[PDB]
């Protein structure tokens, strides 16, 4: 019985490979050989957000593209005002081992989580004026590596227990649990329509889930090592993943396989964070090599470098209006680039 | 300029002031330690003498605070969450010296910690626990360490090794062989920026806190000397 199931799974894998090979009519690099390169994309540090006393582990922008939240090893969840560098808030954290932070699309709530296996929702629009823990979400059996607000009521969190969970914040219960990853899920990215989200785990695979149905639509493979970052394309029909094999790869949801790979011989340091520009033409990747490289998502040629961080770049985000790029680092400094 | 802008700037300055107050208040004369080990080791009882899944242990020795973090709520896969402990002053690695079957697993874990990209700067305070049980096992002799390590047959006790007054030579040779097994990995690829501090601790040892204090003092002194080009 077990052998029959294994053989049928192997033949299903072969059939999927054959279908993908049939769909592979051409390649993104071959098709985009006609279009001109974007040229030397050079940005400069327009703001250096000082105020973190330890390594910055994560950040998240606001939908207003002005307020951004950052999390650090010092145990502070500072909401910044990038326009004027003013610190709007500074939230003390119960655990200093936070690995992720999320800022709600409405801006009323901010979330964080980490090695404490708990996603903590903080109210920013409280009538008393002092931010307090609105809700603590428990149920993950591993470190919470990423979280993203669906809305004021729903949040999606990925954990080191190989599962992604959808939460109902007002009740504090797991509305939906997503299973299928065999490694620590390291990051998740929400689609523009919020009906789908991808996750990148330590099994070198990325899976697309259905938020409403709790089922996995596709599995994307090709990466060689643990995937550290993931980010949907602005179109919503593709995403890019950064892994420990020092390679970024772009996958297409409808084509069900990767389109282009972003790697070089001299690049031997893994990617810690990936993000797309507003048009999706630029893929920004943060590496362990203290630097970030601006890739040409349609041509896989490094169009620029965001040199300027003194330690490992841990987080990287682009505003919803595409006006700026913020990169945090282990040197306790968060920089705004433009 | 405007009233809202002035209020925002004053709030930012107040937040920065409170933030700077918190920073030094909690970071001066306090040190963070990562407690690593296996299930069989007495990691939870090393400095327990006067002690969300991260058992935090706080102890004081000489007006210096030590925050010892024990991660115990994750899966056995640890290549990812261990990078959060880059900035700890030392890693407290506990080994069950009596269990030879898992001692190679402990050696592999020590090697991975030693050679990790984000842990190659942290100095490991090795604690070879269960010394009494190791002594009893070697004295009984039913289980032979040569089966798990054939190169123990050619091993001889180091000249400067300091056995206990009532300690048997066979026990001394076995325990120092295990310590040398760890120290070989420590010195094979060590860049000189971090060091291993082996200690023969027991289940009833009440001086592990002082040992950690002295080792951290030595680690910080060596870091200061390296920073001042004195070492």
């Amino acid at each position: 019985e077990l052998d029959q199931l294994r053989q049928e799974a192997e033949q299903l894998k072969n059939q999927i490979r054959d279908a993908r090979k049939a769909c592979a009519d051409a390649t993104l690099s071959q098709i985009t050989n006609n279009i001109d390169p974007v040229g030397r994309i050079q940005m400069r540090t327009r703001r250096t957000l000082r105020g973190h006393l330890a390594k910055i582990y994560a950040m998240h922008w606001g939908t207003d593209s002005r307020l951004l939240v950052s999390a650090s090893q010092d145990g502070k969840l500072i909401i910044w005002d990038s326009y004027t560098t003013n610190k709007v808030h500074a939230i003390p954290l119960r655990s200093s081992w936070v690995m992720t932070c999320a800022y709600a699309p409405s801006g009323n709530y901010v979330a964080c989580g980490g090695l404490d296996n708990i996603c903590s929702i903080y109210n920013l629009k409280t009538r008393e004026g002092n931010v307090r823990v609105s809700r603590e979400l428990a149920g993950h059996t591993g470190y919470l590596s990423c979280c993203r607000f669906l809305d004021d009521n729903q949040i999606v969190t990925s954990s080191g227990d190989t599962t992604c969970a959808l939460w109902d914040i007002e009740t504090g219960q797991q509305t939906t649990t997503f299973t299928g990853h065999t490694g620590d899920v390291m990051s998740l990215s929400l689609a523009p329509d919020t009906r789908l989200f991808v996750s990148g785990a330590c099994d070198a695979s990325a899976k697309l889930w259905d938020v409403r149905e709790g089922m996995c639509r596709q599995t994307f493979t090709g990466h060689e090592s643990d995937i550290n970052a993931i980010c949907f394309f602005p179109n919503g029909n593709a995403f890019a993943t950064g892994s420990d094999d020092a390679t970024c790869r772009l996958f297409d949801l409808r084509a069900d396989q990767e389109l282009m790979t972003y790697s070089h011989d001299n690049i031997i340091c893994g990617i810690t964070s990936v993000s797309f520009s507003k048009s999706g033409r630029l893929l920004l990747a943060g590496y362990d090599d203290f630097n970030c490289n601006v890739w040409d998502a349609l041509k896989a040629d490094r169009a620029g470098v965001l040199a300027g961080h003194d330690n490992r770049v841990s987080c990287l985000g682009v505003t919803d209006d595409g006006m700026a790029v913020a990169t945090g680092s282990w040197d306790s400094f968060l920089k705004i680039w433009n | 300029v405007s009233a809202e802008d002035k209020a925002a700037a004053e709030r930012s300055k107040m937040i920065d002031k409170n933030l700077r107050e918190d920073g030094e208040k909690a970071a001066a004369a306090t040190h963070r330690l990562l407690l690593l080990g296996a299930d069989n080791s007495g990691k939870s009882t090393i400095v327990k003498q006067m002690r969300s899944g991260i058992f935090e242990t706080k102890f004081q020795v000489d007006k210096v605070n030590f925050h010892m973090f024990d991660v115990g709520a994750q899966r056995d896969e640890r290549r990812k969450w261990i990078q959060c402990f880059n900035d700890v002053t030392a890693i407290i690695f506990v080994v069950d010296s009596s269990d030879y079957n898992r001692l190679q697993e402990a050696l592999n874990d020590f090697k991975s910690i030693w050679n990790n990209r984000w842990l190659r700067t942290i100095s490991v305070i090795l604690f070879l626990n269960k010394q009494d049980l190791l002594a009893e096992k070697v004295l009984a002799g039913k289980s032979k360490i040569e089966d798990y390590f054939p190169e123990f047959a050619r091993y001889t006790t180091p000249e400067d090794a300091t056995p206990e007054p009532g300690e048997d030579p066979r026990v001394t040779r076995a325990k120092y062989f295990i310590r040398d097994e760890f120290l070989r990995i420590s010195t094979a690829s060590g860049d000189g920026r971090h060091y291993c501090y082996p200690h023969f601790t027991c289940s009833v040892d009440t001086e592990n806190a002082r040992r950690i204090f002295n080792d951290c003092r030595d680690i910080i002194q060596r870091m200061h000397l390296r920073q001042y080009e004195l070492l």
Partner: nanobody, 127 residues
Framework: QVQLQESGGGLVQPGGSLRLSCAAS????????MNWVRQAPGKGLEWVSD????????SYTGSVKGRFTISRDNAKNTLYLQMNSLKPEDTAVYYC?????????????????????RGQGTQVTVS
């Protein structure tokens, strides 16, 4: 897809010889360290041998020292374990395991229960 297919191994008399072979796919064999991990019946996973990227540095478990010989063929993307003078204590399922990251000399979760970069494994029985 990162795939590691193990071939060879089976029934053998004590003192015999078996040569396990592992075929790598989906990754560059030369950039990663390779291990051999075995799981005796009723026992957890145990790390048997090791080999670096080039193969100059080879490590062994003390029990299998002088009997097993780990061989790496970078051109053929194959990892071998020349097992000599087998004994009944060697009966286990043998997994070729790939270290998680390239260009690194540390291998953290190779012996994990659900490590992603092992193979299905081959049963080796000594009798």
């Amino acid at each position: 897809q990162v795939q590691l297919q193990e071939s060879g191994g089976g029934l053998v008399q004590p003192g015999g010889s078996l040569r396990l072979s592992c075929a790598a796919s989906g990754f560059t064999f030369s950039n990663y360290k390779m291990n051999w991990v075995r799981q005796a019946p009723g026992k957890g996973l145990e790390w048997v041998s090791d080999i670096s990227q080039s193969g100059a540095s080879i490590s062994y478990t003390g029990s299998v020292k002088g009997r097993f010989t780990i061989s790496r063929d970078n051109a053929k993307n194959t990892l071998y374990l020349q097992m000599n003078s087998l004994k009944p204590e060697d009966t286990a399922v043998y997994y070729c395991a790939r270290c998680p990251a390239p260009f690194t000399r540390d291998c953290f979760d190779v012996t994990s229960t659900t490590y992603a970069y092992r193979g299905q494994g081959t049963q080796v029985t000594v009798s």
